[PDB]
Design a protein around this ligand. Structure first.
Ligand SMILES: CCc1c(-c2ccc(C(=O)NC)nc2)cnc(N)c1-c1ccc(O)cc1
Length: 346
């Protein structure tokens, strides 16, 4: 072990799960809050919050690959294809909704929206009459379209592009009944931790329906997003630093899953491939995951990003604050050592 980090066992077709688990483990401000969940009275076999605490504790302390069977048992994804029937966004939503729920009424309540919540304005503007509706919309990740988009800038541009409402899809303007309108979204705020879902898996019907888009899609190490804000802050530009690149090798149906991280936000990347963690180049983490072409029409080649984590540069120091063995409550420590004391009588 030259990296100082430990891997996660392969225990079935859990797909994106181990990549997610590493990505959240290294969201240090999240990890510390997770350690603070009051799990002492939890049922050791039904608690997703406890199982997540246990995986984090072992990731932080173990020298051997960390198992997850208690985790998959706790949120009930235990059949042969349970993870194949979902995606990384539903897993993460479920996990983090579970931990935030366990945080209610505690000092660490509101951690999840603090780290992940951003605000948009969704607006509908009538063309031939004077009505505009402006509403705030909260989001916790961003799904970016990648088909026909060459880079992340083009994806964000498409995301805030104006949609027309006319003909068979006209707008209910109430008192001025049906009106031709323009529908759009602008960003008000962007969160400290920015999860970008790259929409390579696109459910193309009807009705086969499984597909995966392997086209080239570039993303940068430094992502400036000020130009997509309704209003910019001179003291806090929306500059984001790439933290994690979650990678899939293959096409639809079958594939291999890896995550690249620079856990400290310092540009020193590692590759996390289940139980194997090793240092890699910045080029392996970034440019080599853009996807590409070798043969004609397709090959494919075939190892590209489907999710990215960026951290706001001004928030990097806080999100990635150090975690020590002293940040783990003794109640949790003793419970896990007792568990490891029950598992070692085999
Ligand atoms: C923060 C998780 C989340 C929530 C969400 C928001 C709030 C709460 C909550 O406060 N629950 C009590 N739970 C889940 C809602 N939609 C989402 N797409 C996500 C999400 C975020 C990052 C990802 O990579 C994938 C999914």
């Amino acid at each position: 072990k030259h990296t100082g980090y430990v891997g996660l066992k392969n225990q079935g077709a859990t797909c994106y799960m181990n990549s997610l688990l590493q990505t959240l483990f290294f969201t240090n401000q999240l990890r510390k809050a997770v350690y603070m969940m009051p799990t002492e009275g939890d049922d050791s076999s039904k608690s997703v919050p406890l199982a997540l605490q246990r995986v984090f504790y072992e990731l932080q302390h173990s020298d051997k690959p960390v198992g997850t069977k208690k985790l998959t048992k706790s949120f009930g994804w235990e059949t042969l294809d349970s993870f194949m029937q979902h995606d990384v966004q539903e897993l993460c939503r479920v996990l983090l909704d579970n931990v935030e729920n366990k945080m209610k009424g505690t000092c660490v309540e509101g951690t999840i929206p603090k780290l992940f919540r951003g605000k948009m304005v969704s607006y509908i503007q009538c063309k031939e009459v004077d009505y505009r509706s402006d509403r705030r919309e909260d989001y916790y990740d961003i799904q970016l379209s990648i088909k026909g988009k060459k880079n992340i800038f083009e994806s964000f541009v498409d995301y805030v592009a104006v949609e027309q409402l006319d003909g068979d899809n006209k707008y209910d303007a109430g008192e001025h009944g049906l009106q031709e309108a323009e529908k759009g979204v602008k960003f008000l705020t962007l969160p400290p931790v920015l999860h970008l879902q790259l929409m390579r898996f696109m459910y193309d019907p009807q009705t086969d329906q499984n597909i995966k888009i392997n086209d080239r899609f570039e993303f940068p190490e430094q992502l400036p997003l000020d130009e997509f804000l309704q209003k910019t802050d001179p003291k806090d530009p929306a500059n984001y630093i790439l933290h994690a690149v979650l990678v899939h090798s293959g096409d639809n149906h079958g594939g291999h899953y890896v995550v690249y991280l620079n856990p400290k936000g310092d540009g020193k990347w590692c590759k996390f491939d289940d139980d194997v963690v090793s240092r890699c180049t910045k080029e392996e983490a970034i440019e080599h995951n853009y996807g590409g072409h070798d043969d004609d029409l397709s090959v494919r080649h075939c190892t590209n990003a489907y999710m990215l984590v960026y951290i706001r540069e001004s928030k990097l120091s806080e999100v990635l604050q150090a975690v020590t063995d002293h940040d783990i409550p003794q109640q949790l420590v003793e419970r896990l050592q007792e568990e490891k004391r029950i598992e070692a009588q085999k």
